[PDB]
Amino acid sequence: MNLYTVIFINILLSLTLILVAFWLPQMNLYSEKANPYECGFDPTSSARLPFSMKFFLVAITFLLFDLEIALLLPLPWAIQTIKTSTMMIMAFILVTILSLGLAYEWTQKGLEWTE
């Protein structure tokens, strides 16, 4: 409950701070100040439109590498086992497999962006 308490304290700090920021100052609202910036001129279209991402393959392989992290992360407990050879070989195999996949992607120009 100590940790819950610390987090609630930080939460309430942030919310009290926002309450102050909103209800302490003065307001003069009108449509010409509440509309999006776009550098002095007006936008030509909405921002809720497609933004083509040109690193999507990199995103997906980041997901798979995240899973590889999740598999590598038990090693500090895997080392206090009696075998210490099966874990060695298996971790070697996992890392080498990941490196092989990275190399295939690299050579096939997956780390390059879709111009």
């Binding site: 206090q80 009696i82 210490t84 050879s85 060695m88 080498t96 490196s99």
Partner: protein
């Protein structure tokens, strides 16, 4: 190929280090004598109770007490 590696140590030395360290990690466990004491140390750690054993009357090599001569002397872990 020596010239190729000479070129790669100048251009792209990050992958040279990587392959070198990979091969070193794979080869050095085969070399050392200390490699075998790792499993032995992980085994020596008594995380669980050593459950005693019934005296059948035919257990000479098994000790009758903790600090008897018999059993695995862990002095190899001392002064390793």
């Amino acid at each position: 190929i020596s010239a190729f590696l000479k070129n790669a140590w100048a251009k792209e030395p990050v992958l040279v280090v990587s392959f070198s360290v990979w091969g070193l990690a794979i080869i050095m466990p085969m070399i050392s004598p200390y490699t075998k004491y790792a499993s032995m140390i992980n085994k020596a750690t008594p995380y669980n109770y050593p459950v005693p054993v019934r005296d059948d009357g035919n257990m000479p090599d098994v000790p009758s007490h903790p600090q008897d001569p018999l059993g695995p002397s862990l002095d190899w872990l001392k002064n390793l």
